[PDB]
Design an enzyme around this catalytic site. Structure first.
Site, short mmCIF file in Angstrom:
data_model
loop_
_atom_site.label_atom_id
_atom_site.label_comp_id
_atom_site.label_asym_id
_atom_site.label_seq_id
_atom_site.Cartn_x
_atom_site.Cartn_y
_atom_site.Cartn_z
CD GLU A 45 -2.12 -2.16 1.57
OE1 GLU A 45 -1.12 -2.52 2.21
OE2 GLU A 45 -3.10 -2.93 1.29
N1 LIG Z 1 -1.06 -4.95 3.83
C1 LIG Z 1 -2.41 -5.25 3.57
C2 LIG Z 1 -2.71 -5.79 2.26
O1 LIG Z 1 -1.65 -6.05 1.46
C3 LIG Z 1 -4.02 -6.06 1.87
C4 LIG Z 1 -5.05 -5.81 2.74
C5 LIG Z 1 -4.81 -5.28 4.02
C6 LIG Z 1 -3.48 -5.02 4.42
C7 LIG Z 1 -3.26 -4.53 5.81
O2 LIG Z 1 -2.12 -4.21 6.20
O3 LIG Z 1 -4.27 -4.50 6.58
#
Ligand SMILES: Nc1c(O)cccc1C(=O)O
Ligand SMILES: Nc1c(O)cccc1C(=O)O
Lengths: 278, 279
Positions: A45
């Site tokens: 992200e």
């Molecule tokens: N790091 C995440 C991801 O790659 C997909 C969905 C959620 C997360 C998270 O850190 O919550």
């Protein structure tokens, strides 16, 4: 131009944990450009820090390389740690599409070391696609019922009988792509110490290092299935096999029918700082 | 210890297009094991590390995917040449690699390096001879051309598709491709001067790569050998469209199959960002 930092979330040293790129002063960027920037960074992200609209300290938008999420745990942990540098607050309230998330920052001499968040309380149901998911993962059975949890993203949990069995998984990424808007979290362990691996074509990642929004649900899942007590803090170590060991701390307070708090915490450290041209 | 870096979008003239590479300067103090871990931290198709020269070049460049070192690669070196080109007025730059010294010609416009051209290593090639396995992993029944693998440091397999629509429809089995070690699978379609490519490589740590510069030179050879273009004919190779990273690679292969004299690959590149890291 926008400044960014790179935070390794759920780690106490750079190059461990799960990176997130946190972009500051992002109110000028349209969401389609935020998405493209996330695609450029290619981290699980990237986040964008915006002026608050509902009484928090900031509004944070969260993007995988392929989609926007309404909540995510590692990205918000890293965002909170990075924003904590701006001020002396030890309580920080970050707006998201799932509402305002409360954080407590661990500071030393004003310098932020770690943070704890109160996550949305998830809802859950049976997946109902067991044969298909187990086939995709390359295994015969889950140790516990296969259930899917929603706290913004969705997380499915599949239990493995040993850490070696966890490490031996080689899932069929393409078969997993038939599981839309969810991440598959495979776990193994005992007592206060658990290991995880997460796979999610839907969220643009073959294998994620630290899925913070899965940590809270896992604690619920383990308590619902009798392996820990409600309220018992657990450590969840993710990302070992990919060389990104990530330590998530979780505790789910209450009872199955009425949860009161879902706390996830971790350390985080700055890997780098820079500026993009747009 | 700290290190400055730039992010170059290679094979593009605007940011957010092309294929990003992270270029780390003054990197001699990083052991290769750490360079590897930094490449995974960045999670781009490659990061590069600029080291002092050992054989008469301007610099020695080490190149890492998220999972392995490569002895040569095209988009990472283009980006590195563009980034280093910011630090010199010279028209040519000589980048030492495990495959020898790679010469670049830098193109400047109003005081900015905007593009570069490289002379790649002349590849060797042979039939792959694993056609049923590879075609099944890709989800197709055959190739429009003999399926051949080229080596210029990395290895590149080429599989031809009968239309751009057929190329865009591919949904390869990432896990099944992981049985193809130390290579990238480059699928192509087009005609004349205009070709499209998609690249897939679990071996090199990527589901799908936006711009595989070390495949561009070999594809120009491949197309001339199989009668689709003349030797020496410049081609434009557009990669990365389906993943939202359109990248335009220019390639020309001069000579004839028994003796290639030059394998040229060029492209534009632009700075996306820059910063510093804590190790
Ligand atoms: N790091 C995440 C991801 O790659 C997909 C969905 C959620 C997360 C998270 O850190 O919550
Ligand atoms: N981008 C590349 C990759 O992802 C693997 C191997 C080679 C390259 C390249 O640009 O040449």
């Amino acid at each position: 131009m926008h400044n960014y930092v790179i935070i390794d979330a759920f780690a106490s040293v750079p190059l461990e944990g799960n990176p997130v790129a946190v972009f500051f002063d992002a109110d000028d960027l349209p969401p389609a450009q935020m998405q493209r920037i996330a695609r450029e960074m290619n981290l699980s992200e990237s986040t964008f820090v915006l002026k608050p609209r509902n009484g928090g300290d900031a509004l944070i938008r969260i993007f995988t390389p392929v989609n926007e999420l309404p909540f995510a745990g590692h990205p918000l942990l890293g965002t909170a740690i990075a924003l904590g540098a701006h001020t002396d607050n030890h309580r920080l309230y970050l707006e998201t599409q799932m509402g305002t998330i409360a954080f407590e920052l661990e500071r030393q001499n004003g310098s932020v070391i770690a943070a704890s968040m109160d996550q949305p309380i998830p809802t859950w149901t049976a997946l109902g696609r067991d044969a298909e998911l187990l086939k995709a993962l390359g295994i015969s059975d889950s140790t516990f019922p296969i259930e899917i949890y929603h706290n913004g993203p969705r997380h499915v949990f599949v239990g493995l009988p040993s850490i070696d069995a966890l490490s031996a998984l080689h899932p069929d990424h393409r078969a997993l792509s038939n599981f839309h808007d969810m991440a598959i979290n495979c776990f193994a362990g005992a007592g206060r110490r658990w290991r995880s691996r997460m796979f999610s074509p839907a969220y643009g990642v073959v294998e994620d290092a630290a899925t913070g929004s899965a940590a809270g649900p896992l604690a619920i899942h383990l308590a619902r299935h009798g392996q820990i007590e409600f309220g018992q803090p657990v450590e969840i170590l993710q990302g070992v096999e990919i060389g990104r060991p990530s330590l998530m701390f979780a505790k789910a307070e209450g009872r199955a029918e009425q949860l009161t708090r879902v706390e996830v915490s971790g350390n985080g450290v700055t890997f780098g700082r820079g500026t993009i041209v747009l």
